[PDB]
């Protein structure tokens, strides 16, 4: 997911800009986003939210708007229990499990059901489970006493002022997510939100693995209040952002550093190339217009190519194999953009899959490691050009096996297919540097791949008066069988042709296609 908020000073017209850009699976049902508009005499909200949710998480209206991205707040702890004498060892003594006999029905193939018993046990930590390898684990989840998640979002996206927004956000009923805010009065804010337990020792990695479940020394009870978490409001740089990277460069220049917070709140790992592009795209551009803001969102730079090709190409050129030399010349001529017509892109991904791992997050192959001191220009270089050239040799083979040739047009293999609509793709893997994301699947027998995850709900809002917003929903607004609103937006997506989001009455009336009068009989 991506998120941008621009202060008036950094824009041409003086109105804050907001980008809603969540990245999620295109198939997982509970991850399906739905677009809607709610108008009442007392409030108005437009935006997307996961199906089943009664409030809009990615909302905006004439006055304000917010967006979210995953921050992976570690709000749960998994403890390794030491089983002993019918209980578990805790502080040298044996404690009894809280035991409850339950039962549940399991549907059979023929439609009937059978009763299955289920014993539910709890240690002082929480519910107990047993892994396949026999490990006994207890999960402790923070915020199980926070019943107001849905109402907090309702009050947040419906706040009449930034102070109301903050007061609502401050309730701590939303257990996770980075949340970005922007309004017509000019305020922009970034918050590393979530319910984080206060811990007396241990960094994030320690609390992410199995924590010892044999000592009260690790049994946390309290949680952190809003003012303890990383937050940025109207920073000197005039913008706020987050592309799933740790909260250490939410703006440029930064307004705090890792040492200013407990080492367990967030990781301090290398920022993805997409997150680096995010920071550059915002900081390097001034006098932004909504149109320019929208064009920057389409960024699809093969940033890793800029960090590796200068070293790889010369090394490949000395190899005697004319195919390796041909691949090197193909890669060298490439403009390093994931465009539909790119003939070098597919080959590059295949090399990267080996150089940086299947998820392109590997760091061991770089010559200069990542550093928070140069957050948008490291890692860099190829540590072992010779080994990298062998990887290219193999990549050439993998590219041919998967796509049929080492130079097939990116957009001929990368396709967005929904029902009967089949259109050329562009942009790609975020870990390769692409800001706009399309996590392409493995190709089929003919080298055709489609998005598994990536751009879903995409919206850009300018908080002018009235506001102006544009958006698109990759997989339509409906997924019911036979609907005409599943594949009716993907063609537009392939041309980056966004629709104007209609909030004003006259606009909606001009666009109405169906009317559903209703009577709510309480």
């Amino acid at each position: 997911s991506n998120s941008w908020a621009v202060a008036p000073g950094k824009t041409a017209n003086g109105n804050a800009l907001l980008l809603q850009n969540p990245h999620l699976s295109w198939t997982t049902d509970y991850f399906t986003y739905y677009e809607a508009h709610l108008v009442t005499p007392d409030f108005e909200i437009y935006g997307a939210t996961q199906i089943g949710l009664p409030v809009i998480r990615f909302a905006f209206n004439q006055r304000m708007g917010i967006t979210n991205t995953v921050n992976g707040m570690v709000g749960a702890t998994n403890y390794r229990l030491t089983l002993q004498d019918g209980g578990y060892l805790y502080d040298g003594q044996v404690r009894p499990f809280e035991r409850r006999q339950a039962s549940y029905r399991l549907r059979q193939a023929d439609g009937t059901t059978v009763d299955k018993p289920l014993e539910i046990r709890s240690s002082v930590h929480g519910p107990v489970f047993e892994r396949a390898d026999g490990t006994a684990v207890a999960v402790r989840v923070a915020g199980l006493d926070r019943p107001g998640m849905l109402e907090q979002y309702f009050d947040m996206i419906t706040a009449d002022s930034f102070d109301d927004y903050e007061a609502a956000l401050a309730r701590m009923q939303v257990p996770t997510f980075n949340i970005v805010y922007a309004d017509r009065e000019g305020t922009i804010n970034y918050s590393f939100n979530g319910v984080a337990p206060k811990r007396a020792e241990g960094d994030i990695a320690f609390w992410q693995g199995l924590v010892p479940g044999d000592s009260s020394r690790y049994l946390w009870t309290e949680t952190h209040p809003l003012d303890d978490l990383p937050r940025v409001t109207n920073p000197p740089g005039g913008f706020v952002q987050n592309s799933n990277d740790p909260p250490w460069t939410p703006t440029w220049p930064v307004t705090y550093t890792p040492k200013d917070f407990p080492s367990y709140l967030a990781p301090q790992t290398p920022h993805s190339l997409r997150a680096q592009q995010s920071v550059r795209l915002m900081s390097e551009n001034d006098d932004l217009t909504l149109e320019r803001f929208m064009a920057l969102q389409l960024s699809h730079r093969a940033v890793m190519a800029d960090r590796t090709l200068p070293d790889l190409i010369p090394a490949a050129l000395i190899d005697p194999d004319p195919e390796v030399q041909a691949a090197a010349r193909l890669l060298a001529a490439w403009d390093r953009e994931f465009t539909s017509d790119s003939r070098a892109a597919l080959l590059f991904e295949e090399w990267a899959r080996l150089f940086a791992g299947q998820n392109f997050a590997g760091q061991a192959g770089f010559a200069t490691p990542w550093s928070l001191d140069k957050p948008v220009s490291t890692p860099y270089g190829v540590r072992d050009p010779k080994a990298a050239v062998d990887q290219l040799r193999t990549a050439i083979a993998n590219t041919k096996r998967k796509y049929g040739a080492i130079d097939r047009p990116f957009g001929d293999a990368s396709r967005m297919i929904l029902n009967d609509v089949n259109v050329p793709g562009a942009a790609g893997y975020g870990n390769l540097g692409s800001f706009r994301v399309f996590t392409w699947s493995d190709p089929d027998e003919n080298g055709v791949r489609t998005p598994v995850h990536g751009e879903t709900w995409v919206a850009m809002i300018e908080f002018s008066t009235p506001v102006r917003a544009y958006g698109l929903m990759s997989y339509g607004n409906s997924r019911q069988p036979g609907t005409t609103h599943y594949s009716d937006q993907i063609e537009r997506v392939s041309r980056a042709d966004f629709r104007e989001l209609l909030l004003r009455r006259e606009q909606v009336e001009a666009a109405v296609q169906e009317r559903t009068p209703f009577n709510f009989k309480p």
Binding site: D29, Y30, T32, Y34, A36, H37, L38, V39, T40, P41, G52, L53, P54, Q62, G75, A76, Y104, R105, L106, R107, K116, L118, I120, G126, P127, V128, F129, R131, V137, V139, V141, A142, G143, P147, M149, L150, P175, R184, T465, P466, G476, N477, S478, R479, Q480, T483, T484, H485, D488, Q489, V508, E509, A511, V512, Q513, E514, T516, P517, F518, F520
Partner: protein, 153 residues
Amino acid sequence: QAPIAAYKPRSNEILWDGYGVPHIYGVDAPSAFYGYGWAQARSHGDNILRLYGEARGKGAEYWGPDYEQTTVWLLTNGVPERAQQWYAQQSPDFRANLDAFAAGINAYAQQNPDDISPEVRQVLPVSGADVVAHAHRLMNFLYVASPGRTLGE
């Protein structure tokens, strides 16, 4: 400089555009939530109902083996029950909105029984608590604590 004028609905209606995007106008909050529930049921009713079924801890009962691991996970973590607890702790006004939303889903299924997938009809009717249950599962037991990280899969 002041925002444009806030519109003020005089009747409850949903104005759909050519892309299937619902514009829900309500004379009050409950009406809006009711319309939103109706709209959602019409656009994603099958999967919403199934999801609500799982949040009740009845995925295994309704659909079998493929939903059993989630059932064991939600039951062991007391999700269905805590959902009831969280539902009872809602403010009166917000409980009304949650109830209206649920009523919206039911009304749609009631008016269009042929558009609800057969294997998902058994979930009807949904309640405000089911709405809370799903949100609780999504937030705490999918995003924050996933079965994979605990089970070590």
